[PDB]
A = this chain, B = another copy of it.
Amino acid sequence: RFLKVKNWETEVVLTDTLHLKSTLETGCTEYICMGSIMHPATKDQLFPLAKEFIDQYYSSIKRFGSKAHMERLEEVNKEIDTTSTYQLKDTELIYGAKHAWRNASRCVGRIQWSKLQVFDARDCTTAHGMFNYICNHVKYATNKGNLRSAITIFPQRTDGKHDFRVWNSQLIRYAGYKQPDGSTLGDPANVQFTEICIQQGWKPPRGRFDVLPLLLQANGNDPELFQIPPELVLEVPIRHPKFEWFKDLGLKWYGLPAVSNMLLEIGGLEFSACPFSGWYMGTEIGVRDYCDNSRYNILEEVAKKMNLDMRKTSSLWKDQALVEINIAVLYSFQSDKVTIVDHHSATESFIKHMENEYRCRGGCPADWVWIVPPMSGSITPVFHQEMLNYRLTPSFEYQPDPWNTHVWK
């Protein structure tokens, strides 16, 4: 049955028919909602999954039931029969990748989904080759600050014993170190991965913003360390348009957000290595990266320099320091002409994007809990926007951290 979503600010009402095409589960039941939970093949299973994907591909290019469509199905069935798997055509690969992004309920940036540069790395066989592909990705995506969305797709999972994995959670991240006393130098989110690198032979500068090495795993072998050429890593020193002391905090960040630990699923096939990149919404750095307790935690230091009253919470000193930090981040990127979007602008685009999708697609899966920005929620248009969440394929999925699964040789 059709479902309605209402915007309470504008009273605009959209009708969802798209959810009727979903097949994967949300995590919820009729009795319990799990909307705030972060994480709620064989020949036999594979072909219908493949058949489904091939179907909507040919439906997308308006050639459903064509001879070419029929033949492709017959070709895929025979190939699963003989080899227990199948390979995607280049067109299918690109379509599948764009629609995995399109279907990403938690991404507020999806108005861009069809502008995605797809790099086909399924011929890769070694970690050295993975390194090369990734360098090319980073260079292309960065584009001297005029960032471009991209995804590099490495060979699909075979028997599960020969997975390609990027062990980094992002291509570019700063190191974190457990200090002797107990605190943390650098980025606390990355303390474990940093130690994994150090064990593998990485010589840490033990600085505050050390770019981590790539830890790359090809065909199920032991992962190998590589250093991204520094000239490929674009960074932005964070300063504030009024507070001239803000630069004295010695903060900077990287311009390219590039998530590398997720799994891309297309027509039953699993791509365990598929780093993808876009550009930042300011809050991702300014709110989460800098102000989470389990992160850089600079709220105190900034509020002190703003000489704010920090004894009582009701002075909202945390709230004030937060806005200023996020002003600094936006101002810094824009001044260095590195692509960035503020949460007001991003959330506006998303409402516009939703309207588009309801119009041409009959819906848009959207995770309110993740779509609403981590600051100033209700003065953004998405706060008052009702959303329906459901799981469409092709999709990006979570997967276990490889150091929990890998058997070292």
Contact indicator B22/A388 (Cβ below 8 Å): no
Question: Is B368 in contact with A344, judged by CB distance below 8 angstroms?
Answer: no
Say if the beta carbon of A32 comes within 8 Å of chain B: yes
Find out whether the CB atom of B35 lies under 8 angstroms from the CB atom of A30. Answer: no
Q: A48-56, A94-102, A290-298: which lies at the B interface?
A: A290-298
Q: Are B32 and A390 in contact (CB under 8 A)?
A: yes
Chain A positions 373-399 with a Cβ under 8 Å from a chain B Cβ: 373-379, 383-391
Q: Report the separation of the CA atoms of residues A8 and B378 in the bound assembly, to the nearest whole angstrom.
A: 23
Interface residues of A in 339-369 (CB under 8 A from B): 342, 344-345, 367-369
Could you list some 26 contacts between A and B, CB below 8 A? A9-B292, A22-B32, A23-B31, A25-B31, A26-B32, A27-B33, A29-B29, A31-B391, A33-B35, A34-B388, A35-B368, A35-B369, A35-B389, A287-B378, A291-B378, A314-B330, A314-B334, A318-B344, A318-B376, A319-B375, A319-B376, A322-B376, A369-B369, A374-B377, A374-B378, A375-B376
- Within 8 Å of chain B (Cβ to Cβ): is A38? yes
- A36 interfacial contact with B, CB 8 Å: yes
Contacting pair B288 A316 (CB below 8 A): no
Least Cβ distance of A287 to chain B in Å? 6
A191 in the interface, Cβ–Cβ < 8 Å?
no
Q: Mark A1-38, 1 if CB is under 8 A from B, else 0.
A: 00101101100000000010011111111111111111
- Hey, which chain B residues are within 8 Å of A345, CB to CB? 313-314
- Contact between chains at A386 and B37 (CB < 8 Å): yes
A153 in the interface, Cβ–Cβ < 8 Å? Answer: no
Q: In the complex where A293-B9, A342-B313 touch, is A31 in contact with B26 (Cβ < 8 A)?
A: yes
Contact across chains for A315 and B327 when beta carbons are under 8 A apart: yes
18 new A-B contacts at CB < 8 Å, known A319-B375, A323-B323: A26-B31, A28-B29, A28-B32, A31-B390, A33-B33, A33-B367, A35-B368, A287-B379, A299-B379, A316-B326, A316-B344, A316-B376, A318-B379, A319-B326, A319-B379, A374-B378, A375-B375, A376-B376
| Residues 297 to 347 of chain A near chain B (Cβ within 8 Å) | 299, 313-316, 318-320, 322-323, 326-327, 330-331, 334, 342, 344-345
Tell me if A372 counts as interface (CB < 8 A to partner B).
yes
Residues of B within 8 A of A294 (CB): 8-9
Select from chain B the residue with minimum beta-carbon distance to A323. B319
Q: What chain B residues lie within 8 Å of A5 (beta carbons)?
A: 37
Q: Which residue of B lies closest to A368 (CB)?
A: B36
Could you tell me if A292 and B334 are in contact, using CB atoms closer than 8 angstroms? no
Q: How far does the Cβ of A371 sit from chain B's closest Cβ, in whole Å?
A: 9
Q: Look across to chain B and name the residue whose beta carbon is closest to the beta carbon of A31.
A: B22
Across the A-B interface, the 6 shortest Cβ-Cβ residue pairs? A374-B378, A36-B368, A35-B35, A28-B28, A313-B344, A33-B389
Q: Report the Cα distance A315→B23, complex, angstroms.
A: 42
Bound complex: CA A114 to CA B148 (Å) = 56
Give CA–CA (A401, B341) in the complex, Å. Answer: 41
Assuming A291-B379, A383-B374, is B388 touching A32 (CB within 8 A)? yes
Asked, given contacts A26-B31, A33-B26, A342-B314, whether A377 binds B379 with beta carbons under 8 Å apart, the answer is no
Please give me the residue from chain B that is nearest to A283 by CB atom. B378
Residue of B whose beta carbon sits closest to that of A316: B327
Which B residues lie within 8 Å of A390 (CB)?
Answer: 31-33
A8 CB to nearest B CB, Å: 7
A363 CB, min distance to chain B CBs, angstroms: 10
The CA-CA distance from A344 to B32 in the complex, in Å, is 27
Give Cα distance in the complex from A10 to B313, angstroms: 20
